[PDB]
Amino acid sequence: KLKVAINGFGRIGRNFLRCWHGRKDSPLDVVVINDTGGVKQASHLLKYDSILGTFDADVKTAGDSAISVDGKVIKVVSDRNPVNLPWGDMGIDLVIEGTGVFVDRDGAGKHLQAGAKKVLITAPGKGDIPTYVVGVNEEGYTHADTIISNASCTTNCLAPFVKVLDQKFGIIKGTMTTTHSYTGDQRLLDASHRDLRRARAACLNIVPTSTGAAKAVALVLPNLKGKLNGIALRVPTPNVSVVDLVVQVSKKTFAEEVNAAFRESADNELKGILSVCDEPLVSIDFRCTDVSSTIDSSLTMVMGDDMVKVIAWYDNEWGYSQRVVDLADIVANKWQX
């Protein structure tokens, strides 16, 4: 019921789309996308996926802009100018970019004045960016605040429980890093780009980096700043990615003690947010998995009850979208205006 538009039909697009359809009783009148992508092309890109295979559903871009999916048409156009986008044509409620270029506040506006009302981007935006994610800062969502974004999946991944950890045990300091999947952030081969690594081919390598996550932690958190920081590794995955972390925690303990804490934390608040297991598993074993990540409690070893290595997958794509839907839902629900 919430007229949200999707500029930049990024992988999250079909993801959220498949999510939107995978989600039940949509609070979201998302009848509109936007991307240079070909109407049918996008449809196939929706109708078929390297990750999920084909879309087990109906794909038939109604006319051109609209796309008949399970009867539900959905608009989309091939444009890059925000103000060109027909946000007004439906009087769009929320901005959803995927170009990965609207880290700004302005395009959001350049989307807003074109007929949009709310604003969230997947990646942690740069600037006056309202950090928002489930369990952590999503509660701050009111209708006055409109021009926000989302944290990274990576960010979203660690987000709640690490705080809950600092809540449950207190964290002196902490250092994390992902096994991130390769993305559009890297040209398939080492072609010119800002970051030579991000430029680098690395389709068979790792990306030593540090996403805004290692700082967006501070962003999403009230106090958990600086002391808690690591780096990022976009690594040879096409799929759901894992993320490492060792924490220097306050409370003295052993692992499962905190993993039980993780366990007891898993149900109540991390319901559909995170998970934790110990069956010896690997990457693919969590494709399209609802929650943001599972934890290998066994391999979350501890050193001297402060230094605590931790394990964490994350559905870089889908659970992100899941969370993105969740955040969207949180905004979709309690829709003051």
Ligand X SMILES: NC(=O)c1ccc[n+]([C@@H]2O[C@H](COP(=O)([O-])OP(=O)(O)OC[C@H]3O[C@@H](n4cnc5c(N)ncnc54)[C@H](O)[C@@H]3O)[C@@H](O)[C@H]2O)c1
**CA neighbor of 93 nearest in space, from 176, 28, 37, 42:** 28
Residues 289-318 that bind other proteins (CB under 8 A): none
Give the Cβ contact number of residue 50 at 10 Å.
Answer: 9
CA–CA separation, 63 and 210 (whole Å): 43
CA–CA separation, 9 and 288 (whole Å): 19
Give the Cβ contact number of residue 334 at 10 Å.
Answer: 11
Can you read off the two tokens belonging to residue 68?
A: 């008949």
Q: 23 labelled as ligand-binding?
A: no
Active site residue 153: yes
Binding mask 179-208 for other proteins (x = CB under 8 A): ---xxx-xxxxxxxx--x--xxx-xx----
Q: 153 labelled as ligand-binding?
A: yes
Which of 267, 304, 336, 337 touches a second copy (CB under 8 A)?
A: 304
Q: 263 labelled as ligand-binding?
A: no
Tokens 């972390």 locate to 245
Question: Per-residue DSSP letters for 123-155?
Answer: S--SSS-----TTTTGGG--SS--B-----HHH
Q: 241 labelled as ligand-binding?
A: no
Decide whether 122 or 241 has the Cβ nearer to a second copy. 241
User: Angle 299-316-37 (CA atoms, 0-180°, nearest 5)?
Assistant: 165
Q: 37 labelled as ligand-binding?
A: no
Which of 130, 135, 230, 319 touches a second copy (CB under 8 A)?
A: 230
CA–CA separation, 38 and 9 (whole Å): 10
Which of 127, 142, 201, 252 touches a second copy (CB under 8 A)?
A: 201
Q: Does 91 bind other proteins (CB under 8 A)?
A: no
Q: Does 138 bind ligand X (CB under 6 A)?
A: no
Decide whether 27 or 37 has the Cβ nearer to other proteins. 37
Which of 7, 19, 21, 37 touches other proteins (CB under 8 A)?
A: 37
Tokens 């302005």 locate to 106
Contact partner at residue 123 from a second copy, ligand X, other proteins, none, CB < 5 to 8 Å by partner kind: ligand X
Q: Does 173 bind a second copy (CB under 8 A)?
A: yes
CB of residue 304 to a second copy, shortest distance in Å = 5
Buried b (16+ CB within 10 A) or exposed e, 126-142: eeebbbbbbbbbbeebe
- The binding site comprises 11-12, 35, 80, 152-154, 183, 198, 211-212, 234, 316
Residues designated catalytic: 153
| Residue ranges at the known binding site for D-glyceraldehyde 3-phosphate | 152-154, 183, 198, 211-212, 234
Numbered residues of the known binding site for NADP(+): 11-12, 35, 80, 316
